Amino acid sequence: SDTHIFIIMGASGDLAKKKIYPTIWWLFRDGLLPENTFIVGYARSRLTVADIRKQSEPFFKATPEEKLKLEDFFARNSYVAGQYDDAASYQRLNSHMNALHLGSQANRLFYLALPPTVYEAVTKNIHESCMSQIGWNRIIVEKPFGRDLQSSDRLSNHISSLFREDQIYRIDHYLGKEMVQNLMVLRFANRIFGPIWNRDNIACVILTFKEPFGTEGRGGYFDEFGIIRDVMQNHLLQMLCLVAMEKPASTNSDDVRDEKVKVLKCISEVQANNVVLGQYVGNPDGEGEATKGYLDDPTVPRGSTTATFAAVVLYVENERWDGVPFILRCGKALNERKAEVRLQFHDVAGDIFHQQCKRNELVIRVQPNEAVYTKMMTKKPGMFFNPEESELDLTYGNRYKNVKLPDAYERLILDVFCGSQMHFVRSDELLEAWRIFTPLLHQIELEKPKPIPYIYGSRGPTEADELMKRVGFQYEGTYKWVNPH
Amino acid sequence: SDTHIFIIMGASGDLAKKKIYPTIWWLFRDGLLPENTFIVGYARSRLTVADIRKQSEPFFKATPEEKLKLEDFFARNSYVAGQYDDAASYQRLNSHMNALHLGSQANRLFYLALPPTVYEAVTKNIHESCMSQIGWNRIIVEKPFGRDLQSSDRLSNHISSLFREDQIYRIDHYLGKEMVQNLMVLRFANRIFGPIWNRDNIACVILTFKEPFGTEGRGGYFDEFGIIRDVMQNHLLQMLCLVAMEKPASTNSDDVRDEKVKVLKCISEVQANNVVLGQYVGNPDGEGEATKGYLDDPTVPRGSTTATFAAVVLYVENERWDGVPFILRCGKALNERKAEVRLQFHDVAGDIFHQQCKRNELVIRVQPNEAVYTKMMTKKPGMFFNPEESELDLTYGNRYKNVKLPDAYERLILDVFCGSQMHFVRSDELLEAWRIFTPLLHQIELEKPKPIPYIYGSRGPTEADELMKRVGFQYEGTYKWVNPH
Ligand SMILES: NC(=O)c1ccc[n+]([C@@H]2O[C@H](COP(=O)([O-])OP(=O)(O)OC[C@H]3O[C@@H](n4cnc5c(N)ncnc54)[C@H](OP(=O)(O)O)[C@@H]3O)[C@@H](O)[C@H]2O)c1
Numbered sequence: 012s013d014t015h016i017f018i019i020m021g022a023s024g025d026l027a028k029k030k031i032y033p034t035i036w037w038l039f040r041d042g043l044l045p046e047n048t049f050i051v052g053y054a055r056s057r058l059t060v061a062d063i064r065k066q067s068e069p070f071f072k073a074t075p076e077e078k079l080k081l082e083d084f085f086a087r088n089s090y091v092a093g094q095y096d097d098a099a100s101y102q103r104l105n106s107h108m109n110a111l112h113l114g115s116q117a118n119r120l121f122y123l124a125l126p127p128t129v130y131e132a133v134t135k136n137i138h139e140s141c142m143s144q145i146g147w148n149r150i151i152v153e154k155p156f157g158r159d160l161q162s163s164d165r166l167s168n169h170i171s172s173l174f175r176e177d178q179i180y181r182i183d184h185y186l187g188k189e190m191v192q193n194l195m196v197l198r199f200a201n202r203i204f205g206p207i208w209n210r211d212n213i214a215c216v217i218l219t220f221k222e223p224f225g226t227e228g229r230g231g232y233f234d235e236f237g238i239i240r241d242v243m244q245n246h247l248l249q250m251l252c253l254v255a256m257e258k259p260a261s262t263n264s265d266d267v268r269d270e271k272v273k274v275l276k277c278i279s280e281v282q283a284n285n286v287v288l289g290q291y292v293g294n295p296d297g298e299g300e301a302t303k304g305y306l307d308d309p310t311v312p313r314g315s316t317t318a319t320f321a322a323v324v325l326y327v328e329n330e331r332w333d334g335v336p337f338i339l340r341c342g343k344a345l346n347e348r349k350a351e352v353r354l355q356f357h358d359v360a361g362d363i364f365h366q367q368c369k370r371n372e373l374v375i376r377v378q379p380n381e382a383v384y385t386k387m388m389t390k391k392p393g394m395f396f397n398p399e400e401s402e403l404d405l406t407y408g409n410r411y412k413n414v415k416l417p418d419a420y421e422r423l424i425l426d427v428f429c430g431s432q433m434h435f436v437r438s439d440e441l442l443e444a445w446r447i448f449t450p451l452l453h454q455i456e457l458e459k460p461k462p463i464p465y466i467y468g469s470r471g472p473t474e475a476d477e478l479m480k481r482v483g484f485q486y487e488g489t490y491k492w493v494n495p496h
Numbered sequence: 497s498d499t500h501i502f503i504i505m506g507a508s509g510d511l512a513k514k515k516i517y518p519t520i521w522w523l524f525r526d527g528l529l530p531e532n533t534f535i536v537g538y539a540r541s542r543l544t545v546a547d548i549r550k551q552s553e554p555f556f557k558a559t560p561e562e563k564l565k566l567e568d569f570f571a572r573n574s575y576v577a578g579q580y581d582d583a584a585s586y587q588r589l590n591s592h593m594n595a596l597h598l599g600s601q602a603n604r605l606f607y608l609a610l611p612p613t614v615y616e617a618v619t620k621n622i623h624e625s626c627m628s629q630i631g632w633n634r635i636i637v638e639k640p641f642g643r644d645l646q647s648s649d650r651l652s653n654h655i656s657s658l659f660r661e662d663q664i665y666r667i668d669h670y671l672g673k674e675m676v677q678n679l680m681v682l683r684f685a686n687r688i689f690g691p692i693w694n695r696d697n698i699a700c701v702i703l704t705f706k707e708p709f710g711t712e713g714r715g716g717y718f719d720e721f722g723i724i725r726d727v728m729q730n731h732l733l734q735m736l737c738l739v740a741m742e743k744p745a746s747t748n749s750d751d752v753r754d755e756k757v758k759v760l761k762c763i764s765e766v767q768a769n770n771v772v773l774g775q776y777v778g779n780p781d782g783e784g785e786a787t788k789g790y791l792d793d794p795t796v797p798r799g800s801t802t803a804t805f806a807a808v809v810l811y812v813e814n815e816r817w818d819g820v821p822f823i824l825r826c827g828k829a830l831n832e833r834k835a836e837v838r839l840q841f842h843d844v845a846g847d848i849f850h851q852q853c854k855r856n857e858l859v860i861r862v863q864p865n866e867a868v869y870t871k872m873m874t875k876k877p878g879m880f881f882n883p884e885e886s887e888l889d890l891t892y893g894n895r896y897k898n899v900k901l902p903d904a905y906e907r908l909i910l911d912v913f914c915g916s917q918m919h920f921v922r923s924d925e926l927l928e929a930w931r932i933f934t935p936l937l938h939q940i941e942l943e944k945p946k947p948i949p950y951i952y953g954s955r956g957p958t959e960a961d962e963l964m965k966r967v968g969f970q971y972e973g974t975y976k977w978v979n980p981h
């Protein structure tokens with residue numbers, strides 16, 4: 012029943028236009044926001060709410076029946092022009108917020124839809140000029156959080172000198188995805204997954220992020236950070252933590268994040284011996300973008316060695332996981348779009364089926380086509396006695412046909428309104444993540460190894476499969492699945 | 497490549513006509529029998545193969561393209577008339593078999609499609625007169641194997657004084673069913689089912705046999721043995737053994753049956769305190785047979801107290817199962833046809849989900865609609881965080897749409913040709929089974945308790961649910977499943 016103000020810093024930018032304004036509209040439309048909520052845009056351009064509406068409403072997918080809700084939404088919107096390090100401008104923004112209904116008392120949520128080069132100036136000026144003295148104040152920050160241990164150190168130190176940890180909401184948007192959030196319930200609400208979730212039963216864990224398209228003419232931005240910073244140090248490592256963590260003392264946000272940091276503290280720095288890097292080249296037999304390699308993007312520097320693919324093996328050196336390889340595999344221009352967690356279990360001990368069994372697997376497919384299934388052995392159906400691979404399956408598209416699955420940003424923004432930090436990256440989480448990868452990132456920067464070429468649309472360099480086999484992953488190619496429609 | 501003779505003793509009877517002759521035809525038609533196979537019928541009636549063909553071919557479901565195979569099948573058939581305790585008649589049968597192609601050398605398989613009142617005379621005369629001196633000799637016996645410990649003792653003793661255990665094939669036809677045979681592969685080929693298959697994780701095991709029809713005007717036969725002898729002492733107890741047994745030293749038939757007997761040797765005699773008996777009565781709101789109770793069958797004696805429903809709790813007193821109730825529940829005129837194995841797992845320890853979780857369950861549905869599924873907890877799909885019940889599923893009708901699942905008698909008869917006794921009841925198995933149930937059966941006979949009435953089409957007496965709750969089964973009614981078509 013308190014007033015809430017949602018401040019979109021960088022309201023003129025593309026992320027605000029296509030993602031943040033549509034998301035806050037969808038939450039508003041669905042009745043999920045506090046009744047007394049206002050939206051304030053802030054950016055350099057001299058805009059009006061009319062301009063904000065013209066630019067973003069095409070992405071709202073509004074229906075004719077939503078006309079009244081839409082009018083109320085934009086009546087609750089306003090816009091303040093100003094520079095990002097100009098004190099007087101933030102004084103104008105603060106006075107503007109105070110003048111809203113109960114604006115002095117309101118809770119204030121600042122979304123930094125801005126490039127990281129202005130994070131320090133924006134957070135400094137918000138702290139100096141725009142904090143509520145009565146309501147809470149929360150800041151939402153998106154990546155990049157630095158480029159390595161040192162650069163993340165400095166950003167984190169600046170922000171923490173101003174804001175308490177319970178005011179900082181760092182987005183990793185995979186933490187907003189349906190099946191990523193499900194990892195904790197699958198693991199800790201089920202006896203069928205409890206006593207087997209350990210090194211005595213698990214031979215290897217595979218965390219996968221694949222996209223079938225290349226850089227799409229935007230490689231110049233990607234070239235400055237590469238695939239490990241892009242997808243592995245954040246999304247894949249987050250999935251690792253949720254797969255590996257001990258059971259938390261409760262589902263309180265910091266009991267959960269405590270257990271995630273504890274996992275990271277038992278991972279040593281990755282070394283090049285456990286790393287395979289690739290860069291995609293064009294497929295002469297392909298069509299369209301598939302004929303073009305990474306270096307065929309004219310925004311990519313000539314002779315770039317930036318990796319578009321990486322397979323990395325990590326180890327969690329604790330009692331539950333000692334010696335179990337965690338394989339993190341990701342890349343662009345591969346054969347499919349897929350984000351997935353896979354457990355491969357050890358062979359059954361004391362084989363009585365004359366070497367016909369294959370290792371069980373548990374698969375949590377995050378996207379597309381959200382699903383959980385366990386590959387297991389069944390008696391070959393019919394007049395046969397030999398075991399054959401089959402699966403127990405849960406596919407959301409068929410089990411939950413009419414259930415809307417919210418976008419990650421819908422879920423995460425709502426969490427900030429509700430004060431739940433469970434699905435946001437804590438300061439110490441971030442530090443450990445950079446600790447694990449910075450020696451490798453510095454060696455790549457220093458020595459500039461040439462990545463292994465792989466053809467657009469392939470599974471990546473075969474050396475990645477060899478690395479996975481070396482550490483204990485077994486692939487047979489015997490499993491046959493066809494959709495029961 | 498040896499000659500094989502399949503002798504149907506009782507070839508004129510209904511079981512031979514509708515089941516045994518059609519089954520041996522189906523195996524023949526499918527190329528599964530040895531090339532040099534002959535079928536010999538033996539019964540009292542003075543019949544010809546023409547008569548055998550006229551009576552049984554309607555149950556063959558032959559196609560026009562099978563005409564030549566059918567003609568060869570009946571060319572390989574012959575019939576010998578004779579009495580079941582007449583030495584000269586068995587001498588005629590033996591000479592008839594000798595006169596077949598390599599008949600002196602042939603393997604001989606005797607199927608006793610006969611009432612149990614002639615078992616002793618038939619086996620005695622087969623042993624005296626019709627055994628091959630070169631090939632093997634195997635006898636297939638169907639239930640009843642006695643009515644209690646004493647009466648089974650005498651039959652077993654008679655048969656074992658004549659035949660070695662590796663010549664005796666006692667049918668429990670549930671051992672021929674697809675999903676019953678799968679129990680051993682599911683349990684022992686999968687790490688995901690290994691470390692949880694014990695008293696630390698399992699709260700109760702439920703073994704269910706339900707039919708939705710009553711005695712259908714044939715209650716007079718049923719009345720002499722009742723539901724425990726009919727379905728529980730055999731089919732359900734066999735499913736118990738396969739669920740409970742330790743891992744066998746190999747899949748050799750007697751290593752497997754060793755482990756099944758070992759289970760039974762740790763089950764104490766069941767006492768009335770762990771037993772609920774019911775008898776169905778008519779449903780006045782029903783239609784057809786549903787309006788008629790057990791006593792409304794005019795072939796049932798007036799005032800019969802025979803139970804048509806039983807729920808019994810057994811305990812396997814060993815390290816794996818100590819204290820885990822095994823609930824055996826079966827009956828006629830219930831709400832569905834179903835044969836099923838269910839494991840209900842213990843609550844997860846150290847609840848962090850505020851009492852929202854439900855116990856996991858593993859279900860192996862033997863019939864109809866063969867399936868395996870695990871009821872488990874998933875995050876409620878959508879913008880919710882609470883756990884909700886769902887399932888991982890394998891349904892044969894959708895996963896294996898075009899795979900023929902053979903009838904139990906097809907599978908079991910073929911096993912006799914192949915010499916596999918794994919799915920047949922050993923002598924010591926039978927003895928333990930009768931040991932467990934005979935004190936209860938004698939008390940029922942002596943005291944004649946009146947069974948609890950239950951209406952046709954219901955789930956049975958509510959006292960059965962109370963018994964299941966008392967020993968630890970939990971039912972919430974919260975699980976909702978709808979078919980993903
Ligand atoms: N509910 C459902 O939708 C459902 C259920 C069951 C199965 N399926 C589908 O059935 C198909 C097969 O299932 P699956 O992928 O889980 O089992 P799979 O084909 O046996 O593959 C298991 C793993 O081995 C990897 N792989 C493939 N070739 C390899 C190689 N030469 N060396 C090393 N690793 C290799 C695969 O990598 P990649 O990640 O690159 O493929 C995959 O991660 C999939 O398309 C799956 O989506 C769907």
Ligand SMILES: NC(=O)c1ccc[n+]([C@@H]2O[C@H](COP(=O)([O-])OP(=O)(O)OC[C@H]3O[C@@H](n4cnc5c(N)ncnc54)[C@H](OP(=O)(O)O)[C@@H]3O)[C@@H](O)[C@H]2O)c1
Pocket residue numbers: 704834838859865867868869887889890891955961964971973974975977
């Ligand atoms: N692949 C598939 O076909 C598939 C997969 C999943 C679910 N389903 C179907 O979904 C429906 C529900 O699944 P489910 O039966 O496994 O779970 P459930 O409805 O939660 O029932 C679990 C057990 O509780 C018993 N029960 C019902 N009422 C009871 C009561 N008052 N007291 C004590 N026990 C009671 C049931 O006995 P009964 O044996 O008499 O029912 C059943 O064995 C079923 O019809 C199932 O066939 C099908």
